[PDB]
């Protein structure tokens, strides 16, 4: 009865860590955030 909890949750973590993954590596020398 809780489908949206397993699929829609993993998808939210797929693009949340994917997008911020690179943006964190590149740059980040002078300004931290």
Curated annotation (Swiss-Prot):
Locations listed in the record: Cell membrane; Basolateral cell membrane
TM annotation in the entry: 12-30
Subunit structure comment from the entry: A dimer in solution, but in its membrane environment, it exists primarily as a mixture of dimers and tetramers and spans the membrane asymmetrically. Component of the ankyrin-1 complex in the erythrocyte, composed of ANK1, RHCE, RHAG, SLC4A1, EPB42, GYPA, GYPB and AQP1. Interacts with STOM; this interaction positively regulates SLC4A1 activity. Interacts with GYPA; a GYPA monomer is bound at each end of the SLC4A1 dimer forming a heterotetramer. Three SLC4A1 dimers (Band 3-I, Band 3-II and Band 3-III) participates in the ankyrin-1 complex.
Tissue localization of expression: Detected in erythrocytes (at protein level).
Residue span relative to the full protein: 389 to 430 of 911
Post-translational modification: N-glycosylated.
Species of provenance: Homo sapiens (Human)
Family label: Belongs to the anion exchanger (TC 2.A.31) family.
Protein name: Band 3 anion transport protein
Involvement in disorder: Ovalocytosis, Southeast Asian: An autosomal dominant hematologic disorder characterized by ovalocytic erythrocytes that are rigid and exhibit reduced expression of many erythrocyte antigens. Clinical manifestations include mild hemolysis, intermittent jaundice and gallstones. However, the disorder is most often asymptomatic.
Reported function: Functions both as a transporter that mediates electroneutral anion exchange across the cell membrane and as a structural protein. Component of the ankyrin-1 complex of the erythrocyte membrane; required for normal flexibility and stability of the erythrocyte membrane and for normal erythrocyte shape via the interactions of its cytoplasmic domain with cytoskeletal proteins, glycolytic enzymes, and hemoglobin. Functions as a transporter that mediates the 1:1 exchange of inorganic anions across the erythrocyte membrane. (Microbial infection) Acts as a receptor for P.falciparum (isolate 3D7) MSP9 and thus, facilitates merozoite invasion of erythrocytes. Acts as a receptor for P.falciparum (isolate 3D7) MSP1 and thus, facilitates merozoite invasion of erythrocytes.
Signal sequence bounds: none
């Amino acid at each position: 009865r809780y489908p949206y909890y397993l699929s829609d949750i993993t998808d939210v973590i797929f693009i949340y860590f994917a997008a911020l993954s690179p943006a964190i590596t590149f740059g980040g020398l002078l300004g931290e955030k």
